Amino acid sequence: HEVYIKSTETGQYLRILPDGTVDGTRDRSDQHIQLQLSAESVGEVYIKSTETGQYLRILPDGTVDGTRDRSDQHIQLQLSAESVGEVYIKSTETGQYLRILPDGTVDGTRDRSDQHIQLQLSA
Secondary structure (H helix, E strand, C coil): EEEEEEEEECEEEEEEEECEEEEECCCCCHHCEEEEEEEEEECCEEECCCCCCCEEECCCCCCEEEEEECCCCCCCCCEEEECCEEEEEEEEECCCCCEECCCCEEEECCCCCCCCEEEEECC
């Protein structure tokens, strides 16, 4: 099924744009917030846009973007649950958590105390 990832702090939905850009939006009508999960291996997943087919990617410098290169080795992500409906998205290769900032910016960060990394998963 398709899934929607939203910031529980800001209410912004994770959005993957066709030009490879990733940001946050509260526009529930936006088609590019529709995502889909798939397992690569035990404990790790791919997060794909259903509209564009890009994979969510977390680069070492903290940038978060999209790529259709399924072979890319920064698209391996970890969904860790913190309660029901509630998750963290971490890049196990870099150790960075996915972060959604209230200005709409989406990036990666390594500090677990960050107040913008707790996310909501709905299907």
